Amino acid sequence: FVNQHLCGSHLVQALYLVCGERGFFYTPKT
Amino acid sequence: GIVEQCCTSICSLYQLENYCN
């Protein structure tokens, strides 16, 4: 449950820095 | 997805970029 929830918070954080400009879609497991 | 490619394992800022729009 929260591990994947924990990690995800870091995840979408990195994706804000790296993607900056173009933004992104956070789609979990999918 | 993103979770198993990058949580269990480790992504660089290059690998993670795959994931931009």
Please state the domain extents for chain A. 1-30
DSSP notation for B1-21: -HHHHHTSS---TTTSGGG--
Neighbours of B1 (CB within 10 A): 12
- A23 CB neighbours in chain B (<8 A) are 20-21
- Resolution in Å, one decimal, please: 2.5
Nearest to B1 by CA among A29, A15, A1: A29
Tell me how far apart the alpha carbons of residues A2 and B15 are, in angstroms, rounded to a whole number: 24
How long is chain B?
21
Q: Left if phi > 0, otherwise alpha if psi is -120 to 50, otherwise beta: which for A20?
A: left
Tell me how far apart the alpha carbons of residues A25 and B15 are, in angstroms, rounded to a whole number: 15
| Contact flag A18-B1 (C-beta cutoff 8 Å) | no
Helix then strand count (H, E) for chain A reads 1, 0
**Technique used by the depositors:** X-ray
Nearest to A19 by CA among A30, A11, A7: A11
Tell whether B17 lies on the interface with A, counting CB pairs under 8 A: yes
